[PDB]
Design an enzyme around this catalytic site. Structure first.
Site, PDB file in Angstrom:
ATOM      1  CG  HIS A  45      10.351 -42.584 -13.839  1.00  0.00           C
ATOM      2  ND1 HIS A  45      10.640 -41.539 -14.694  1.00  0.00           N
ATOM      3  CD2 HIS A  45      10.313 -42.054 -12.594  1.00  0.00           C
ATOM      4  CE1 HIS A  45      10.766 -40.424 -13.993  1.00  0.00           C
ATOM      5  NE2 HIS A  45      10.577 -40.709 -12.715  1.00  0.00           N
ATOM      6  CD  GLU A  59      -3.300 -28.492  -5.291  1.00  0.00           C
ATOM      7  OE1 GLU A  59      -3.692 -29.366  -4.493  1.00  0.00           O
ATOM      8  OE2 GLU A  59      -3.691 -27.316  -5.232  1.00  0.00           O
ATOM      9  CG  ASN A  61      -0.333 -24.510  -0.340  1.00  0.00           C
ATOM     10  OD1 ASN A  61      -0.213 -25.619   0.176  1.00  0.00           O
ATOM     11  ND2 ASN A  61       0.157 -23.409   0.216  1.00  0.00           N
ATOM     12  CD  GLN A  64      -2.271 -22.887   2.938  1.00  0.00           C
ATOM     13  OE1 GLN A  64      -2.827 -22.030   2.248  1.00  0.00           O
ATOM     14  NE2 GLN A  64      -1.289 -22.601   3.786  1.00  0.00           N
ATOM     15  CD  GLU A  69      -7.773 -27.129  -4.557  1.00  0.00           C
ATOM     16  OE1 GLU A  69      -8.881 -26.589  -4.765  1.00  0.00           O
ATOM     17  OE2 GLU A  69      -7.113 -26.891  -3.532  1.00  0.00           O
ATOM     18  CG  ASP A  93      10.642 -41.912 -18.228  1.00  0.00           C
ATOM     19  OD1 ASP A  93      11.391 -41.322 -17.434  1.00  0.00           O
ATOM     20  OD2 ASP A  93       9.585 -42.457 -17.861  1.00  0.00           O
ATOM     21  N   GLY A 186      10.081 -35.968  -7.482  1.00  0.00           N
ATOM     22  CA  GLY A 186       8.735 -35.440  -7.328  1.00  0.00           C
ATOM     23  C   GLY A 186       8.406 -34.472  -8.458  1.00  0.00           C
ATOM     24  CB  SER A 188       9.693 -37.750 -12.252  1.00  0.00           C
ATOM     25  OG  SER A 188      10.963 -37.798 -11.625  1.00  0.00           O
ATOM     26  N   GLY A 189       7.943 -36.381 -14.655  1.00  0.00           N
ATOM     27  CA  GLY A 189       6.673 -36.492 -15.346  1.00  0.00           C
ATOM     28  C   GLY A 189       6.129 -35.120 -15.679  1.00  0.00           C
TER      29      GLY A 189
HETATM   30 NA    NA Z   1      -4.604 -27.186  -2.768  1.00  0.00          NA
END
Ligand code: NA
Length: 240
Positions: A45, A59, A61, A64, A69, A93, A186, A188-189
């Site tokens: 979904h 990741e 934050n 910032q 990353e 799902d 947010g 989800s997944g």
């Molecule tokens: Na960041």
């Protein structure tokens, strides 16, 4: 994640942020788990929308520079063939994303470990949900990666009438339901990490919460049971 605490920056190195192009910028939309250097597992979904997606690994934050990353385009999306967007309770799902380039592994970026096929957690097993989801029902995304402790709730209980009833299936895992901590939009997944035999594995892909709100008593967060899809996953990666 509601009622969570900030994660140490190297605790959950398989966690990713799935983001979509919003104007000249990117916005976080859901989570997922790195399962090969060039494959990510998320919820079907999450990729219903016809958006441009990218994956961010290492990741911590969202708002910032962390100095860790790696940003990678999504090249192919494979959704489970039985997934039906207007029937999340039917299950299936889950979706796999092949990345444009393979990511580099380090202390902030590692492959998630999957449970062996068929594995089911005993009632009340220690699990953590992680993500950048809303920190309160109808709230705002967290800045920094959150984690929350959510003991599993076995099928016999979660499928009883005062919990989720028939809406929950054997192909799902339920966790939490205490009314203080839960998944939220947010998240989800994103992974549910459970400690088994000394080692954290990803047992769940966050799928849904109640419409009544994220942290509601006797409505544990519902996750797709990863151990039910091991062959599917292998088949897809083998064939792509
Ligand atoms: Na960041």
């Amino acid at each position: 994640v509601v009622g969570g605490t900030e994660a140490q920056r190297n605790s959950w190195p398989s966690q990713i942020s799935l983001q979509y192009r919003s104007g000249s910028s990117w916005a976080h939309t859901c989570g997922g788990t790195l399962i090969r250097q060039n494959w990510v597992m998320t919820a079907a979904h999450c990729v219903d929308r016809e958006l441009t997606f990218r994956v961010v690994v290492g990741e911590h934050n969202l708002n910032q520079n962390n100095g860790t990353e790696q940003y990678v385009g999504v090249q192919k999306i494979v959704v489970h063939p039985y997934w039906n967007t207007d029937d999340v309770a039917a299950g299936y799902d889950i979706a796999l994303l092949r990345l444009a380039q393979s990511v580099t592994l380090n202390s902030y970026v590692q492959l998630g470990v999957l449970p062996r096929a068929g594995t089911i957690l005993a009632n009340n097993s220690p699990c953590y949900i992680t993500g950048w989801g809303l920190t309160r029902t109808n709230g705002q995304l967290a800045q920094t990666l959150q984690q929350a402790y959510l003991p599993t709730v076995d099928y016999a209980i979660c499928s009883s009438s005062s919990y989720w009833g028939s809406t929950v299936k054997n192909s799902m895992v339920c966790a939490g339901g205490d009314g203080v901590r839960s998944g939220c939009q947010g998240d989800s997944g994103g992974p549910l990490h459970c400690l088994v035999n000394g080692q954290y594995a990803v047992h769940g892909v966050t799928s849904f919460v109640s419409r009544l709100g994220c942290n509601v008593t006797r409505k544990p967060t519902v996750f797709t049971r990863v151990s039910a899809y091991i062959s599917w996953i292998n088949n897809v990666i083998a064939s792509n």
